[PDB]
């Protein structure tokens, strides 16, 4: 089966994440945008990372994102189907 | 278990939402972006948060209260399953 | 209900809109611009919350409308929605 | 001479602005993006940013088209005119 | 009489500090912000904030001082000032 | 100094980036995505504040990288302060 992985990371770790995913060979699967979050309130500029991966690739992915970036969270959510167009 | 709550809202309701989420103590879990929608071209705000299943009803009602006007298109809230969350 | 997401070529934004206008499905769609990688790429991300019964036709529509000619247009994913609330 | 016309408008005015510029015959000159602004912890606003580059001659008529379409009031927005040294069209 | 546009590209992590410094100065209302991509050298990819404020010519130096102070670590980004011919309120 | 903004076809984003990488100007460049109209268009917008002596080169680099057979605005800058 497939899974959507999303990570909301500190903006300044964009490069390290990019580099980490280049190296693991999974950059092409990654979409990135920039979003607004909050602390304390306080205004935070975050980067949101989206990747749809194989169930089997999930654990490794979380590890590779976590190491690259270590503010942040990663959530995994189910996918019914993918159609590569 | 864990749920993702997403809303598409009137752009003009951003501060009311933000203030309600501050008051409710959930703000740090919320991220926002601005997206294009369609009536007709629309500039909307997309809201995202991940919450305990037990806090879902309180989040829904908090967003709706902060952002409704009497509907000529106030928006939509969707809840979706989350398998896992990792704090880095 | 389901969520339909697609990451498509930026150049295909109009052929998507028009295709979705005609099907009566445009109102459901939200669009954002995001970055992918192939190399740095500018893509469009589409998001639709749809009746389950409409999902095959929506996928078929998005595919014919965007079909790169050739290699790596992008991807359409479907994921579950527990509920949707229409805001007052 | 050429000018850049920028406007920060109410997000709910994007369609009405767009419609007026279709009518005007200028739409193709318009670029839009969505930006954050602030009101009076400050108030967080979600706004629409408008960029059009026009001939000096068309500037007054444009400020007017923009204002008409977008006013309510209490937003409504602001329009800035700035100079442009040159425009190069790529083909 | 004269108006200027003050634009700055800053490190993303300095968003709060700039916000707070502008609130204090009573200048925040004039500011729009958006998130952009920029580049560095090992090219590296950088998340940035683009700041945009239209100000009275006489407030320009203060504004530069304010942004500069709020966002420096050293180095950080840049600020640039350009002319505005007119401003109209809708 | 002058500000150069360029609104370009989205699918030319990489060609332009690597062109500026080569030229040694990449660090001055900011990119975003905007919407235009032709009809709804996803555009890429590029911003760079450049020395006046570099403007001709920049225009040439951008046009040559992006053209297929968009637009670039050059506008004045009163000053730049590096933070």
CATH of the domain at A78: 3.30.70.120
Structure tokens at E85: 């011919």
- Interchain proximity A85–C63, CB inside 8 Å: yes
Tell me which residue in B15, B35, B36 faces D45 most closely, judged by beta carbons: B15
Q: Which domain holds residue B27?
A: 1-88
Q: Which residues pair with F48 in a beta bridge?
A: F4, F29
Cα of E43 to nearest chain D Cα, Å? 26
Longest distance between any two alpha carbons in chain D, whole Å? 48
Compute, in degrees rounded to 10, the torsion defined by CA atoms D43, D47, D53, D54: -90
Using what technique was this structure determined? X-ray
Q: Is A12 helix (H, G, I), strand (E, B) or coil?
A: helix
Q: What whole-number distance in Å separates Cα of residue E8 and Cα of residue A77?
A: 38
Cβ contacts below 8 Å, chain C against chain F, sum to 34
Structure tokens at A73: 């969270």
Compute, in degrees rounded to 10, the torsion defined by CA atoms D11, D15, D16, D22: 140
**Residues on chain F touching C44 (C-beta within 8 angstroms):** 42
Cα of B19 to nearest chain A Cα, Å? 9
Structure tokens at E84: 């505005």
Question: Which of B27-32's residues contact partners 24+ apart within 8 Å by CB, and which partners?
Answer: B27/A38, B27/A41, B28/A37, B28/A38, B28/A39, B28/A40, B30/A37, B30/A38, B31/A8, B31/A35, B31/A36, B31/A37, B31/A46, B31/A48, B32/A35, B32/A36, B32/A37
Q: What whole-number distance in Å separates Cα of residue F36 and Cα of residue D51?
A: 10
Q: Exposure pattern of B33-49 as b/e (b: 16+ CB <10 Å)?
A: bbbbbbeebbbbbbbbb
Residue of D nearest to B46 (CA): D46
Query: What is the DSSP code string of B48-88?
Result: EEEEEGGGHHHHHHHHHHHH-SS-SS-EEEEEEEESEEEE-
Compute, in degrees rounded to 10, the torsion defined by CA atoms B56, B57, B61, B62: -40
Cα of E22 to nearest chain D Cα, Å? 10
Q: Is F2 helix (H, G, I), strand (E, B) or coil?
A: strand
Tell me which residue in C10, C14, C17 faces F11 most closely, judged by beta carbons: C10
Phi, psi of F31 (to 5 degrees): -125, 140
- Interchain proximity F37–D51, CB inside 8 Å: no
Structure tokens at F44: 């890429």
Compute, in degrees rounded to 10, the torsion defined by CA atoms E22, F46, F21, F13: 130
Answer yes or no: are the C-beta atoms of E48 and E35 closer than 8 Å.
Answer: yes
Q: What whole-number distance in Å separates Cα of residue B31 and Cα of residue C3?
A: 19
- Interchain proximity C36–A52, CB inside 8 Å: no
Phi-psi region of C53 (alpha: psi -120 to 50; beta: other; left: phi over 0): alpha
Tell me which residue in C34, C68, C77 faces A52 most closely, judged by beta carbons: C77
Structure tokens at F2: 């002058």
Q: What whole-number distance in Å separates Cα of residue E87 and Cα of residue E13?
A: 31
Please count the structural domains in chain F: 1
- Interchain proximity B37–C29, CB inside 8 Å: yes
Residue of A nearest to E47 (CA): A11
D76 burial type by CB count under 10 A (0-12 exposed, 13-18 middle, 19+ buried): middle
The sign of the CA dihedral A6, A10, A12, A13 is negative
Answer yes or no: are the C-beta atoms of C50 and C44 closer than 8 Å.
Answer: no
Task: Report resolution (Å) to 1 decimal.
Answer: 2.0
Phi, psi of B71 (to 5 degrees): 50, 75
Q: What whole-number distance in Å separates Cα of residue D46 and Cα of residue B42?
A: 12
Q: What whole-number distance in Å separates Cα of residue F72 and Cα of residue F59?
A: 7
Tell me which residue in A4, A33, A77 faces C32 most closely, judged by beta carbons: A33
**Residues on chain B touching C26 (C-beta within 8 angstroms):** 38
- Interchain proximity D31–F43, CB inside 8 Å: yes
CA-nearest of A16, C33, F4, A30 to E40 is: A16
Cα of B40 to nearest chain D Cα, Å? 6
Cα of A57 to nearest chain C Cα, Å? 17
Residue B11 parent element (H or E)? none
CA-nearest of C44, C18, C73 to F10 is: C44
Structure tokens at B20: 């309600």
- Interchain proximity F13–C44, CB inside 8 Å: no
- Interchain proximity B82–A75, CB inside 8 Å: yes
Any residues with CB less than 8 A from the CB of C41 and at least 6 apart, and which? C35, F13, F14
- Interchain proximity B79–C82, CB inside 8 Å: yes
Q: What whole-number distance in Å separates Cα of residue D78 and Cα of residue E63?
A: 20
Answer yes or no: are the C-beta atoms of F79 and E81 closer than 8 Å.
Answer: yes
Answer yes or no: are the C-beta atoms of D9 and D60 closer than 8 Å.
Answer: no
Query: What is the DSSP code string of D17-78?
Result: HHHHHHHHT-GGGEEEEEEEEEE--PEEEEEEEEEEEEEGGGHHHHHHHHHHHH------EE
**Residues on chain D touching B44 (C-beta within 8 angstroms):** 11
Q: Which of C12, C33, C34, C73 to mutate to test the interface with F (most CBs of F within 10 A)?
A: C33
Q: What whole-number distance in Å separates Cα of residue E67 and Cα of residue F83?
A: 9
Phi, psi of A78 (to 5 degrees): -85, 150
Q: What whole-number distance in Å separates Cα of residue C63 and Cα of residue C61?
A: 5
Q: What whole-number distance in Å separates Cα of residue E43 and Cα of residue A28?
A: 17
- Interchain proximity A75–B85, CB inside 8 Å: yes
Compute the C-alpha angle D32/D36/D41, nearest 5°: 165
Q: What whole-number distance in Å separates Cα of residue A83 and Cα of residue B24?
A: 40
Residue with tokens 């030319």: F12
Note the residue count of chain B: 88
Cα of C72 to nearest chain F Cα, Å? 13
Tell me which residue in A4, A32, A81 faces C34 most closely, judged by beta carbons: A32
């Amino acid at each position: 089966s497939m899974k959507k992985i999303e990570a909301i990371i500190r903006s300044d770790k964009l490069e390290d994440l990019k580099a980490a995913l280049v190296q693991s060979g999974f950059i092409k699967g990654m979409t990135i945008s920039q979003v607004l979050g909050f602390g304390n309130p306080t205004l935070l500029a975050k980067v949101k990372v989206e990747i749809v991966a194989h169930d089997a690739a999930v654990e490794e992915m979380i590890t590779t994102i976590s190491q690259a970036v270590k503010d942040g969270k990663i959530f995994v959510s189910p996918v019914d189907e993918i159609v590569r167009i």
